[model samples]
Target: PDDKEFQSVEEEMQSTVREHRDGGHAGGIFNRYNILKIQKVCNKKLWERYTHRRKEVSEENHNHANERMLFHGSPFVNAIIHKGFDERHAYIGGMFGAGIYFAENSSKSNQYVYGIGGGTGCPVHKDRSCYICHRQLLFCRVTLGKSFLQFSAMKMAHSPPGHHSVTGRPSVNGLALAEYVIYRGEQAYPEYLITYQIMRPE
Candidate 1:
């Protein structure tokens, strides 16, 4: 099957992001799985900040400011270097898969509301006996303000119609994706994190 052919990491990541943005959700602006991964990586630090800030923003009654000040970015294509199986790592996956962050701010009122960035794949050494191969990759971002905490992540995967998968499922092979969002002045933390696994076609 043509879909079964081994897809280069670059091709997989790029196509995956496109699929999510085009129809997966999040207003076709973000990759769901990638966002989730970012939240997972920066979990505790992000949540705590979101909680404290939301309270302060609410007490001050900064409704408009709160709404406008939010986090937003996209996954970029960079590069991942594999070193003879054992000890494989990547640093680039956005724009050129160079592993760097990029963003653009649109709103004049809130500098934080509109910005873009990405990451780069570095190298890693693994155990001598065990062969470490670079499996998959994904991207995401997190934003925390005095009013809300937002996150988004996504993973690229292969699926058939009428059968969808969720986080923690096997079949997922690319990068893990997820996101978290916390609104200001909202009770009970007002936060949620979602994720998806990236799987390559086999």
Candidate 2:
């Protein structure tokens, strides 16, 4: 097995779920349903750009880009898959800044996963309300360059001075869950989209 493509990574991801329960640390209420690999929709330009930045940051950080596989949940899964992460689309009022947010914990991302349904956000899909309990979370490779620990909310349009990203550590600044925020969209590549259904906690 070459393990060259996304298909080869399915088993690894499944074992990942087994090692650390999906949405387990938060409340243990969701079950792993499916892991769909994200095909690189665009050409090499995007990835090349990311690598360029990665190289720059890696050099600055003593040869460590500090890249990590993180999770982000949103209703605009299709849009993200098509265009990648865009800071312009990010919501304001983030505790750190209006940057794209990622989490090491899947349970934290689950809070933002919006299932298409009559009562959920964006109820009308294709001009009609549909009931679907399945939710999605994007697993991304985030280039977290020298991160600045954020203790409080700030109206920042970019990362802090000399830092490429922001981090909110749990138990610090009154944050419940640790989160990573990168100012640039190119700092992340959506590698996989996991679809799952919420189940009763047993």
Candidate 3:
């Protein structure tokens, strides 16, 4: 609904940054999908610049939200956000840069976006109708250990074991999608998959 006079996602992003700046952000160091404190380790300018670039992309896409952006942070095709997710290579995942990006951690659940000084973070998203972005910064996402695990958009849970039509290929959700993953901390226990933020167009 705000699209009637949208200045940009930049301002949306900038406002969230302020939340962290003024102590509006409160919780355990890693509260429900809040990203790590980026201001501490990341250069302020870098964060600003990253936000600006993201705004450009978000605006360019016209909040169409389906457009792909190669913003993934990886030498192996890393740090790219296409369709709101990081693109991963067949190799390994690593936290390589001072840039902002999305990620899921082994120790936590909920969507993760990377901030400069902060260790983990979440994105503001649609909780319901009217494209009312969550207006707060939070959410983390993760990849399955074996690319063979996959689910569909908005599906609540992982597919049953061996649900994949093709085992040779990694199981997947949407295009290179990322979401929060929870580990049970034991060898025999199966890991639980959370989710990427889901949106329903108003």
Best lDDT goes to which candidate?
Answer: 2
Q: What is the total number of backbone clashes in candidate 2? A: 0
**Candidates arranged by lDDT, highest first:** 2, 1, 3
lDDT of 3 by residue, 96-191 (tens): 111123322211111222322322333343122112222122222122222233344222233224221111211342333332221211101111
TM-score of each: 0.22, 0.73, 0.21
In model 1, where do residues sit more than 4 Å from their true spots?
1-49, 61-122, 125-197
Clash count, one per candidate: 67, 0, 37
Give the Å error, residue 132, model 1.
7.6
Report every candidate's CA lDDT.
Answer: 0.24, 0.66, 0.24
From the highest TM-score down, the ranking of the candidates is: 2, 1, 3
Top model number, TM-score: 2
Residue-level lDDT of model 1, residues 1-202, one tens digit each, is 3333222322333343433321312221333223122122234544465455545545555442133221223221121111110101223332222212211121110111111211121124321111222212222222222322112232222111221111221125432333222221121121211122323323
Error of 1 at 98 (Å): 20
lDDT of 2 by residue, 1-202 (tens): 3346655444434433322233243323443434433443453665676788888989888898999888787778778876778898766677776899887766566656553121243334421111234556777889998999876776688888888898888674377667899989888887776665544434
